[PDB]
């Protein structure tokens, strides 16, 4: 599978990272799995988990007020609710299903402490056993770190294990686990990434990320028709093309098609 992935890199003029944890009956899959890639919006999934972890469910009903000023990035939802504000739960919802920039920042602020909550967020990843990932900026900055910069990066290996713990493990109590899972299930932004590479009778829930330098990611939990779960982390960028390099969704879809062929 190493050969096919390399071929995808040259076919799409990109760097590709894949990680699929091993299961009782499937070997792990690994390609540049320990190389660093920018999070982009993929961090919003563990972010919601952080918020859920730190509070009882009733916190979800806490209304957050904000102004026009508090919108500095792509925020499809937060733009619509400026006059009323949004509850923590709505911000969680906006962050996973619409990748809303302000929603993510308001949740970072909810976590508390330095860096507008980025330190607390990294701390939470550390508490999960993730020694690799780091978040240093908020939106939109965190998507604009150049190649080579370590700020706001994870690895496929690291983020896959994190997602596994959160969705399939017991990092959260079942109630909180179901909310995170449910939100991810109702996301549609990933229809052309991992979802496109798996057969349509599989279940796929995911969180995407996109950025400069041809950056496109997708992190997913997938279930076979028989109810057999897997975790799939696919990350890419095209630094060779500079800031404006186009991201390629189809690279991720093809990568996923290879993964699916092995697991099916
Ligand atoms: C997250 O990566 N971002 C927020 C928004 N949604 O893109 S996503 O659906 O791929 O997550 C726009 C792109 C990106 C950003 N803030 O640049
Ligand atoms: Zn924990
Ligand atoms: Zn490791």
Numbering used by the authors: 29 to 57, 59 to 83, 86 to 145, 145A, 145B, 145C, 145D, 146 to 238, ...
Q: Which lines from the publication concern this structure?
A:
Unlike clavulanic acid, avibactam is a reversible covalent inhibitor and does not display secondary chemistry upon binding. Short soaking (∼10 min) did not reveal any detectable density for either of the inhibitors. In the crystal structure of the I105R variant in the complex with avibactam, the sulfate moiety of the carbamyl adduct of avibactam occupies the carboxylate binding pocket and engages in H-bonding with Ser130, Thr235, and Thr237. The electron density of the Arg105 side chain was missing, indicating elevated dynamics of this residue upon binding. The avibactam-bound structure showed an inward-oriented sulfate moiety of the carbamyl adduct, which is likely engaged in H-bonding with Ser130, Thr235, and Thr237. In all instances, this is speculated to be a stable inactive conformation of the inhibitor, which is substantially more resistant to hydrolysis than clavulanic acid.
pmcAntibiotic resistance mediated by β-lactamase-producing bacteria has become one of the major threats to global health. This phenomenon has substantially reduced the efficacy of β-lactam drugs, which are the most commonly prescribed antibiotics worldwide. β-Lactamases (EC.3.5.2.6) are a group of enzymes that can hydrolyze the amide bond of the β-lactam ring, thus making the antibiotics inactive. One such residue, at position 105 (standard Ambler numbering), is suggested to play an important role in substrate discrimination of class A enzymes. Interestingly, BlaC, the β-lactamase from Mycobacterium tuberculosis, possesses Ile at this position, sparking the question about the evolutionary preference for this amino acid.
